[PDB]
Design a protein around this ligand. Structure first.
Ligand code: HEM
Ligand code: HEM
Ligand SMILES: CCN(C)CCc1cc(F)c(F)c(OCc2cc(C)cc(N)n2)c1
Ligand SMILES: CCN(C)CCc1cc(F)c(F)c(OCc2cc(C)cc(N)n2)c1
Ligand SMILES: C[C@H](O)[C@H](O)[C@H]1CNc2nc(N)[nH]c(=O)c2N1
Ligand SMILES: C[C@H](O)[C@H](O)[C@H]1CNc2nc(N)[nH]c(=O)c2N1
Ligand SMILES: [Zn+2]
Lengths: 414, 414
């Protein structure tokens, strides 16, 4: 029954939820790895024996969720998937068990500050899919729906679960919409340095790059273990916000823009022991993810010098805080640009307050809320947002989202 | 033999130092408490039995440090304090063992970004002190020395170790130089809200407050268990930087200022099992500690609105990032003000780069460097400083600095 304090408000919350926790974290009693980016625990091949307790555990919270824990419909469903796990060494979720598992995977994501919206998640069941083309169609219907003309909506599309392991649905994109990354002669990078390995993988499979900055990458979709295939999202479906500033008219001259739809596609969704290797999910952007990380990370677009230049900034000494000054401006423009286009965006203040609000309800009507402070604190102006001052317990509940290796490092090809 | 990566540079460092670790962290395999502010492990009454392994462990690294591990002078010193621990149920450090233990307490402080300077620490041995007045004199000689007319120097003053526990030297100030905090009629706060409980404690013992903003508090010094006593640092010894901006001439009109000398006085220094309950230590300020936390924390001076006002800032909508804009300005002024006065200050960029440099040498010539990411990442512009992208292993080595309860909640009075 652990206590967590908010040192800005002296609010104390009591966490019992962490007792239901199951998975391990990477920390021990003599070492804390809370700052390791991809702990071996957060990465993802299972058998039929451990598979039933997982099913049991998940089915018991789900019937407990729809009020009727331990009833006949529960006991039958337990026997039912017991039977099905004996016979097939795996099983299938009901439509509702899948919607529930997905929403709670998000709910349990300790690194996600947007979780106040976890209950309003749209679950598209793609488990009937069999081909890369059908994947492409489900993904496009996802994009269109979640984009909703800038009034963005949370959604997830769940392709068939892993079975043997060699028959595996995977989106090879990290996100359905990402800009291409091209190395240059001198070595420098056009576009997004993050995706340079992925961009050339696409060309290795036949992409015809328009070698510029913001070239929306094509989808590389692997279906049921087969070699992936290239499909270009219809451009009318990829909404984009050109970035201007509400003061500096040279900001348009910077010629930047970003897509409205954040949509992570490389993660693994775990539910009742079942593994969904392709499950792209989307919501809306927090300002900082674009203006701080995408735009100003050194190994991303790296625009701080160019913005500071135009601002006429003391770029000599480090202590001029020119980098900080040009970073707040870039985030002012991103927010303003997205808002003047009716494209859903949230600032890091509004988003981190709501997370504290969310944390309250989770400790009240759930007994806790796993939270990773390393990741919840926004990457600029940490301590002026209320999550900097909120102690948080990190633990691993299931259903959950896990990392998984890249397909091209595991795919037994051709 | 754990690995930590820098995701900005793809640098990998290998940590074996954590194997020498001894104390626990608060994390377990199923829960990470890396964001708990004062874990029960980081707080501080010991006997004579566990006291010798502690002495042994510390003496073995110290003679290993001066090259002659296991020699006769080592073995004799081991027998010597063995003998002394049998006879007195405690023991005394040699002058050099104390200088070493202190420097390594700092070296091991995982929450300190300034640790690149740990070897150049000036150790003042105050273990002959017996009276609050003698404390006051050692503390003043500390202030004067460390201040060094703005060319600040790192130092620590070590008062006698705890023995029985009822005879205990304690500085009741959190820092030797802090501004007084006064509640008002309407409830609001003049001065520093942090110290309001301490400020009225001082008046409870007879302080004559000049009830303004930046009133340097008096020292409240407890010596050998006796009731503490009030002493006012000579004002010529308290250096102060008035805060101006190198653009906004109304910034002087804000009328702010800060002391040059950060000097934490409430911590407990542990060496070879011995407990030094009063051990004030000082270095120089990182810009952000004043301009971000001191000035802009909600429950500190809370000047963001007043600075934004004068900047003529979009203070209506939250998403205007006015708070961020006024926060970078305040930090530009702090750095500039301290630098135009030849008072040693370091910006959070320069300081966090040096910490990465420091981390390199610690993994190379020591096998690791315990680091608390929650605390090493500066509280503004996190991800544009290189420590945001540096994975860090947190573990607890000794000699170390520990928190300890406030004296007025433990002091058996009068
Ligand atoms: C609705 C708006 C949302 C916002 C504003 C939001 C915000 C964020 C942010 C800022 C991060 C940190 C990632 C980074 O900065 O690199 C994150 C991580 C994450 N989010 Fe959310 N998110 C949203 C929706 C969703 C949805 C719909 C899901 C799943 C269905 C989700 C699941 C996750 C996961 C799994 C992580 C990372 C966990 C990890 O890395 O281990 N989020 N989110
Ligand atoms: C020389 C310049 C120094 C700088 C720039 C510096 C910087 C910092 C900063 C920014 C923090 C985080 C505290 C906060 O933001 O609230 C910190 C913590 C700390 N520093 Fe350093 N510091 C310096 C010198 C020292 C010295 C001389 C010592 C000890 C002799 C020391 C030991 C510590 C300890 C023990 C902590 C906190 C550990 C904890 O809270 O558990 N530092 N320092
Ligand atoms: C190398 C890893 N690093 C780059 C972080 C990558 C990452 C992994 C992950 F699973 C995530 F959910 C993630 O969330 C971004 C995100 C997703 C959604 C739906 C909304 C918002 N607003 N944001 C970001
Ligand atoms: C409630 C706790 N919270 C307010 C943090 C307090 C705290 C505790 C502590 F032991 C510290 F060493 C500390 O370091 C401040 C510091 C010290 C020195 C020598 C230099 C710099 N530049 N800075 C700050
Ligand atoms: C070293 C550290 O684990 C890494 O830089 C983390 C820190 N916190 C983060 N927080 C978020 N939201 N996103 C990130 O990519 C990271 N990166
Ligand atoms: C909740 C959290 O533990 C607390 O706010 C910490 C976060 N990191 C920090 N880091 C530093 N340097 N100083 C602090 O006071 C804090 N506060
Ligand atoms: Zn931990």
């Amino acid at each position: 029954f652990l206590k967590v304090k908010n040192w800005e408000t002296d609010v104390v919350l009591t966490d019992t939820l962490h007792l239901k926790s199951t998975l391990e974290t990477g920390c021990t009693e003599h070492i804390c790895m809370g700052s390791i980016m991809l702990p071996s625990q957060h990465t993802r091949v299972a058998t039929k024996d451990q598979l039933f307790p997982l099913a049991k555990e998940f089915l018991d919270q789900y019937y407990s969720s729809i009020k009727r824990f331990g009833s006949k419909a529960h006991m039958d469903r337990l026997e039912e998937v017991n039977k099905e796990i004996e016979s097939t060494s795996t099983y299938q979720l009901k439509d509702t068990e899948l919607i529930y598992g997905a929403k709670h995977a998000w709910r349990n994501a300790s690194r996600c500050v947007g979780r106040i919206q976890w209950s309003k998640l749209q679950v598209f069941d793609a488990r009937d899919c069999t081909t890369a083309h059908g994947m492409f169609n489900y993904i496009c219907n996802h994009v269109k729906y979640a984009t909703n003309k800038g009034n963005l909506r949370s959604a997830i599309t769940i392709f068939p679960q892993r079975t043997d392991g060699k028959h595996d649905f995977r989106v090879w994109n990290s996100q359905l919409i990402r800009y291409a990354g091209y190395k240059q002669p001198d070595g420098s990078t056009l576009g997004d340095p993050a995706n340079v390995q992925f961009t050339e993988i696409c060309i290795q499979q036949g992409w015809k790059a328009p070698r510029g900055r913001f070239d929306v990458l094509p989808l590389l979709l692997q279906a049921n273990g087969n070699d992936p295939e290239l499909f270009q999202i219809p451009p009318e479906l990829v909404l984009e916000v050109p970035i201007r500033h509400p003061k500096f008219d040279w900001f348009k001259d910077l010629g930047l823009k970003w897509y409205g739809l954040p949509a992570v596609s490389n993660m693994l969704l775990e539910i009742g022991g079942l593994e969904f290797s392709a499950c792209p999910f989307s919501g809306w952007y927090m300002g900082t993810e674009i203006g701080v990380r995408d735009y100003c990370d050194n190994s991303r677009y790296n625009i701080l010098e160019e913005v500071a230049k135009k601002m006429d900034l003391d770029m000599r000494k480090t202590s001029s805080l020119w980098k900080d000054q040009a970073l707040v401006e870039i985030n002012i423009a991103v927010l303003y640009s997205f808002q003047s286009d009716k494209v859903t965006i949230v600032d890091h203040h509004s988003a981190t307050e709501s997370f504290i609000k969310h944390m309250e309800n989770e400790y009240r009507c759930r007994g806790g809320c796993p939270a990773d402070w390393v990741w919840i604190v926004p990457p600029m102006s940490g301590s002026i947002t209320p999550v900097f001052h909120q102690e948080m317990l990190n633990y691993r509940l299931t259903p959950s989202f896990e990392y998984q290796p890249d397909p091209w490092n595991t795919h037994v090809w051709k």
